């Protein structure tokens, strides 16, 4: 985020009381569950700065829905699911 991102949210607050920005990633690389989310609040600061508007990180999580896994989860077809109880838990341990 460049510093200019402060002005994008404050303009559209007429549409929504608090506009949440979502930083995404088109090319998956690192380190884990991708993208990002921020919320716009004002914490000022302890040092005495004029009121500071800084986006605080919002934890992002992927979720599912009915009927949307039809074409989505079809095209992969190469995954082994899972297998829970043998390899699933131990690969996580190494990671």
């Amino acid at each position: 985020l460049h510093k200019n991102d402060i002005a994008i949210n404050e303009l559209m607050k007429r549409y929504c009381p608090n506009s949440v920005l979502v930083i995404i990633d088109v090319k998956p690389k690192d380190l884990g569950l991708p993208t990002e989310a921020y919320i716009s609040v004002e914490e000022v600061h302890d040092d005495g700065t004029p009121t500071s508007k800084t986006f605080e990180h919002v934890t992002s999580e992927i979720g599912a829905e009915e009927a949307e896994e039809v074409g989505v989860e079809h095209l992969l077809r190469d995954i082994k699911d899972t297998t829970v109880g043998t390899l699933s838990q131990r690969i996580t341990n190494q990671v």
Partner: protein, 373 residues
């Protein structure tokens, strides 16, 4: 009307030079240069009978101009009330400027901070907190100016003068140290601020930690000019803890107000070691022997109960006490601040968990990768 400023033209040497421009300011109808030049006259120290005669015309100025923010109207009237000296007839005029001026910029936050400032002669404790609390209610949104928050601290700091919850003054100091970045006032005034700030903040025990932001850069620059023995005993409550000579040193220089909190501040250093000795060491070494508490905290065996169990209610340690061998067991921990030796002490015992686990984690990856494939 133009003849009013011609008789007040020359107040002395150098005064007319800036006043020749002042008369051309309103004739040109430019109210900014007229705001700043009057503010420059307001900034210029005066008796002041000059701003007191013009306040009638400045009142007429705000009428038909209707635009210029009351912030400049409050800055001029606070120099005028110094000539009036009467808070009564001034607050009637102060509220008059509040009701007559309505703009998108809040006129209540600047007036209520001016009301409580003139309310110091009421003297205090009665109607103060009502107009003090009204400030931050309207100031909650939107505190973009952030300069009026210092005026909100003033009447809030004078509300503490009733004594008044000393622990709240250091919390009220956060509304000062957090109102404006730069000092913009003589450091000698703030070196006598940390004089009573370190004392009073240490006096009231309502705040259990009190050492979180005590390393803040803007207050420690004052702690360099401030009396050094007061800071060395502040590091006792900041880190310390004992340092038995330093916790007495605060009773050496400043006698008063510390007599009732002496035995109490002797209690705070006794609960400050309980969290550190387990924090400084890697432990565990969790359960502690009473003789060790009787060494550091130098407390008798019969009083160790009240000591460590009071820390259970404070919340720095939850550890139950084993009373058969009289050994005090610890649970959890209370972290406080940090030091340069703490980061170096961290990398020793923190990364040691990283290098030990990953080393044997490869052993889990090595042997067991064949049974997975």
């Amino acid at each position: 009307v133009p003849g009013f400023l011609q008789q007040s033209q020359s107040s002395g040497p150098g005064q007319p030079a800036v006043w020749h421009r002042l008369e051309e300011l309103y004739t040109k109808k430019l109210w900014h240069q007229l705001t700043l030049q009057v503010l420059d006259f307001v900034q210029d120290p005066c008796f002041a009978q000059g701003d007191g005669l013009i306040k009638l015309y400045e009142n007429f100025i705000s009428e038909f101009e209707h635009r210029v923010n009351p912030l400049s109207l409050v800055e001029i009237i606070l120099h005028v009330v110094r000539q009036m000296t009467d808070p009564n007839v001034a607050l009637t005029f102060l509220e008059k400027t509040r009701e007559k001026v309505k703009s998108s910029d809040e006129a209540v936050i600047l007036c209520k901070t001016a009301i409580g400032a003139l309310k110091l002669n009421i003297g205090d404790l009665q109607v103060t907190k009502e107009t003090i609390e009204d400030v931050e209610e309207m100031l909650n949104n939107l505190p973009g100016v952030t300069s009026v928050h210092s005026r909100f601290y003033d009447l809030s700091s004078k509300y503490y003068q009733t004594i008044g919850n000393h622990a709240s003054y250091y919390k009220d100091a956060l509304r000062f140290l957090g109102c404006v970045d730069i000092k913009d006032l003589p450091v000698s005034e703030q070196q006598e601020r940390a004089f009573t700030l370190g004392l009073a903040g240490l006096l009231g025990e309502g705040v259990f930690n009190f050492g979180e932001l005590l390393m803040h850069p803007v207050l420690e620059s004052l702690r360099n000019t401030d009396r050094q023995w007061l800071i060395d005993t502040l590091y006792a409550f900041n880190s310390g803890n004992v340092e038995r000579f330093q916790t007495l040193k605060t009773a050496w220089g400043q006698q008063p107000d510390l007599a009732a909190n002496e035995a109490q501040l002797l209690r705070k250093i006794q609960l400050l070691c309980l969290m550190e000795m387990t924090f400084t060491r890697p432990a565990n070494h969790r359960q502690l022997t009473f003789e060790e508490i009787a060494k550091s905290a130098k407390i008798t065996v019969n009083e160790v109960e009240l000591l460590v169990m009071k820390a259970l209610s404070v919340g720095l340690v939850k550890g139950s006490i084993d009373e058969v061998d009289k050994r005090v067991h610890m649970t959890w921990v209370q972290p406080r601040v940090l030091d340069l030796q703490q980061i170096k002490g961290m990398k020793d015992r923190l990364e040691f968990w990283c290098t030990d686990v990953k080393s044997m984690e490869m052993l889990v990856e090595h042997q067991a990768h064949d049974i997975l494939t």
